[PDB]
Amino acid sequence: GARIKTLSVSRPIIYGNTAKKMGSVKPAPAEHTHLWTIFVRGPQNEDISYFIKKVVFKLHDTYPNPVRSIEAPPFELTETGWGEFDINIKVYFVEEANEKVLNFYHRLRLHPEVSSVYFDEIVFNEPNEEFFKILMSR
């Protein structure tokens, strides 16, 4: 059979954090006990910048300049810390998409190298023809 349906295009995405207890020699406040990296990337670390313009990570208010804008790949940031907290993640798509910001969050994990990584997909419903061309450009 055949039927008309809303257009949908999916793009695989990997996001989350890694963490490691810091050794003898520290990088950095003395209070800090862990090194951690929060990130958004593609599978096999393939480029995602062709449909993602920038990624903004908002850290806890205890961090200086908690709004960290990463406007070029790799869309990640490495920091030091002592505590676990919720990091707000805003994904901005390229201007061709004419899309609202994609908002989600990730709970930074430091305790059971520790890692908290998700392998999901971003679903674009009703994309415009131009952004569709970009998404299909692979």
């Binding site: 806890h60 505590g83 907290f85 305790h111």
Partner: peptide, 8 residues
């Protein structure tokens, strides 16, 4: 106020 402890 947002929570931030050694472990959540």
């Amino acid at each position: 106020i947002m929570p931030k402890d050694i472990q959540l």
